[PDB]
Design a protein around this ligand. Structure first.
Ligand SMILES: *[C@@H]1O[C@H](CO)[C@@H](O)[C@H](O)[C@H]1NC(C)=O
Ligand SMILES: *[C@H]1O[C@H](CO)[C@@H](O)[C@H](O)[C@@H]1O
Ligand SMILES: *[C@H]1O[C@H](CO)[C@@H](O)[C@H](O)[C@@H]1O
Lengths: 52, 92
């Protein structure tokens, strides 16, 4: 019995929800021909004890 | 979003909204100029840009001040008269 816990590598979470599609200084771009940008987030969950 | 129009009015004048409310322009009467800032940009924090001078001094309230012609601070080989700290309109 060694009293040191082993490293565990973190695993990826699922992909989040897509952010609202806007453009800077372009009011609301809904139902128009104005291309915007949107984002999505993940979370590295589970890395403990100097894991990868 | 559009900036809030609170605390942005000027003492002795009005304003008009340009660039779809993303910039205000102060409208002082004839013979006055808006103190330092002529216009204000709408920064995306809810508040407008601060009343910064050319020396970057924070002015709290804005006011239409009188228009002065630039004073002669240098003149050689003669004498000009009268000397004044500032010159109002229609001075000779
Ligand atoms: C110009 O106008 C100001 C405004 O009050 C006044 O005080 C001053 O005496 C006037 N004349 C000159 C020469 O500055
Ligand atoms: C997000 O992207 C795809 C699903 O669209 C998969 O590779 C996985 O579920 C990931 O979390
Ligand atoms: C963003 O993209 C689509 C919606 O257009 C879906 O697969 C999901 O809601 C994702 O978050």
């Amino acid at each position: 019995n060694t009293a040191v816990p082993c490293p565990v590598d973190g695993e990826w979470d699922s992909w989040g929800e897509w952010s609202p599609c806007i453009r800077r200084n372009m009011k609301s771009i809904s139902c128009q021909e104005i291309p915007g940008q949107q984002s999505r987030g993940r979370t590295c969950r589970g890395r403990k004890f100097d894991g990868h | 979003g559009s900036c809030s129009l609170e605390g942005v009015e000027i003492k002795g004048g009005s304003f008009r909204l340009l660039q779809e409310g993303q910039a205000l322009e102060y409208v002082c009467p004839s013979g006055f100029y808006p103190y330092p800032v002529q216009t204000r940009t709408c920064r995306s924090t809810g508040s407008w840009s601060t009343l910064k001078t050319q020396d970057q001094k924070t002015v709290r309230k804005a006011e239409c001040r009188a228009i002065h012609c630039p004073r002669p601070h240098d003149f050689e080989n003669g004498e000009y008269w009268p000397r004044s700290p500032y010159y109002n309109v229609s001075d000779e």
